[PDB]
Every structure is written in C-alpha cells, then in structure tokens.
From TrEMBL:
Binding residues for guanosine: I97, D216
Nucleotide-binding among keywords: yes
Annotated binding of ADP, by residue: D32, C33, K45, T95, I97
Residues reported to bind Mg(2+) 2: D216, D219
Organism for this UniProt entry: Enterococcus casseliflavus (Enterococcus flavescens)
The protein, known as: APH(2'')-Id
Ranges where the Aminoglycoside phosphotransferase domain occurs: 40-254
Keyword Nucleotide-binding: yes
Binding site for adenosine: T95, I97, D216
Gene: aph(2'')-Id
Length: 296
C-alpha cells in the first residue's frame, strides 16, 4: 500500500476533525510502516500491508499497557485509527521521542564513561522490560518458536523446490531438524521483549550524552529475552560483542555462551528469512541474497 500527504491528512481529519495539521513531513520508513512527523511533536504510522497493520495494532496495545513502567521514555499513544477490511489498525499517532539514533559510530566516538553509562542504561531498560508481569497478556502476543520454525520450513521447501539440488535441500532440512532438536531455543523463561532492539531504535541526547529513549515496539512480543541482546550483536550495522557483553553483565546474565550460540543460529537463519519475506512481499533482491547465501 502507498500514501500521499493528502490521503494521510484525510484519514486523520476523518477521525480527528478538530486536530488542525500545520506541518507534515515523512520521518522515516520501516519494514511495516511509513512514519509521518506532524506538527513537529507527533509521529503518525501508516501501514504498508496487512501484517504491518496487525503489528501496529499490537504496538498500540503494548505501548498503552507498558506506559510509564519503563526507565526510558517510549512513545505514548495519542491518536488511533480503525479497522479497514484487511487492516486491523488504519494508523496510529504517537508522541515523538527527541534525539538521534545511537549508531555504532556515534557510540564509539563517545568517551568511555558515557559508553559505559550507555551500556548500563540499556541493561536497566531491558531488565525492567523483561520483568514486567506477563499474566495479563493474551495468547496471540506469545511467540511459539517451534510453530515459526515448522511453518518456515514448509515455506522454504515449497519456495526453493526448484532452486536447490537434492543434497542442498537435505542440508536445509537437516538445519531445521537440528534447531528443533536442540532444547536451548525453547527452554527459556518467556517475558515481554522488544523484539526489534537495535541501534536505530535507541535514541540519544548528544547534549547530555545519555540515552533518551526507545522506539518501535511494532514487533514487541512475549518471547525469549536473549533475543533483545542478539539483535545488538552484529559487528557492522550493530554494536560489537564487546559492548553487548558490557550490557549482559550489567543485566547480570548468567549464561553468555547460550546467547552467543543463539546469535550464531539466528545469523544462519536470516538467509531463510530473506527468502520467505523476499517472496512474501516484493523484493526479489532479498530473495536472491538469501538464495546466494544458502548456496555459498
Ligand atoms: N515515536 C517516535 N519518536 C521519534 N521518532 C520516531 C517515532 N516513531 C518513529 N520514528 C521514526 O520513524 C522511523 C520508523 O519508525 P519505526 O517504528 O521504527 O518503523 P517500523 O515499525 O516500520 O520498523 C524510525 O526509525 C524513526 O526515525
Ligand atoms: Mg523501525
Ligand atoms: Mg517495527
């Protein structure tokens, strides 16, 4: 799905007649939504597809129920859209978190005290998040990893049936079986996780040199807390293993080798993710990357 500035203003006016829009510009794109900065202070998200609308609905709900529970600012829900045939949530408007992404580059050019404070503040944020009680959240917010693996396996076997040689598809089937047979991916204490926890969602106040917010809870779910560390670990694009180690220890994690193992698994698994989502949407260049990584 695609939007003009006019369509965006029209959707909003339709449910918020008195809200007069003075300025509008595009703040960012993501995997699910286009984000619009409206009147300087609000960020509106419009969904590009069915799945993104579904995630936007869950974002709104999760953000409302963890409002004011966390030690870092997070977006607050101010405006809400509505259902549309195939879209659960037509748009949502949030408070804008001030600041700039704490990029790997930015982090490494900070002095060591601030670097270390940052690791501490991230650890504390994740410790609080992972400590929120999950008894009240519905079934759909829980992630069944076994179900995900098994459904991905079937999607891979259909999609690649004519791309891969027999022995290669055998190796793919082996890879999945090994994941399923290894209990380390399923035997965890589930909690609320961010599930997209990376440097571009970590906003930074470069005047105080401290982290001043966390954004994008679109993927937030009940799942494995180790995933919030793994997503920061990739050498380029994200932070080093050295810096996440600092976070893990502030967090008081007792099994960093397991986090490392899980990371290594997700690193291989990403190629299949690219194949599935490369087809499932429209980018045949994400499809071709994954396929090339498998054949490598
Ligand atoms: N509440 C917010 N405060 C400040 N900036 C935001 C906010 N929401 C979104 N943005 C900007 O819009 C971009 C896309 O938002 P995001 O929620 O990450 O999209 P997606 O859910 O599609 O991944 C972000 O990278 C950020 O630059
Ligand atoms: Mg994002
Ligand atoms: Mg998202």
């Amino acid at each position: 799905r695609t939007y003009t500035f006019d369509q965006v203003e029209k959707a909003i006016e339709q449910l918020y007649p008195d809200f007069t829009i003075n300025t509008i510009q595009i703040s960012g794109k993501g995997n699910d939504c286009i984000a619009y900065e409206i009147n300087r202070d609000f960020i509106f998200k419009f969904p590009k597809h069915s799945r993104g609308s579904t995630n936007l609905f869950n974002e709104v709900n999760i953000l409302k129920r963890i409002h004011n529970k966390l030690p870092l600012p997070i977006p607050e829900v101010v405006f809400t859209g509505m259902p549309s045939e195939t879209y659960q949530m037509s748009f949502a408007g949030f408070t804008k978190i001030k600041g700039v992404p704490l990029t790997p580059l930015l982090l490494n050019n900070l002095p060591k005290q601030s670097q270390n404070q940052a690791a501490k503040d991230l650890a504390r944020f994740l410790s609080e998040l992972h400590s929120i009680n999950i008894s009240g959240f519905k079934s759909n917010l829980v992630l069944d990893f076994r179900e995900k693996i098994n459904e991905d396996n079937k999607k891979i076997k259909k999609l690649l049936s004519r791309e891969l040689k027999g022995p290669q598809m055998k190796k793919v089937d082996d890879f999945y079986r090994d994941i399923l047979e290894n209990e380390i991916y399923f035997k965890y204490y589930p909690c609320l996780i961010h599930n997209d926890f990376s440097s571009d969602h970590i906003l930074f106040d470069t005047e105080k040199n401290t982290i001043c917010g966390i954004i994008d809870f679109g993927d937030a779910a009940i799942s494995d807390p180790d995933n919030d560390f793994i997503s920061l670990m990739e050498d380029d694009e994200e932070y080093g293993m050295e810096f996440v180690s600092k976070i893990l220890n502030h967090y008081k994690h007792k099994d960093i080798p397991t986090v490392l193992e899980k990371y290594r698994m997700k690193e291989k698994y990403w190629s299949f993710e690219k194949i599935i989502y490369g087809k499932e949407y429209g980018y045949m260049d994400w499809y071709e990357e994954g396929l090339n990584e498998i054949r490598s």
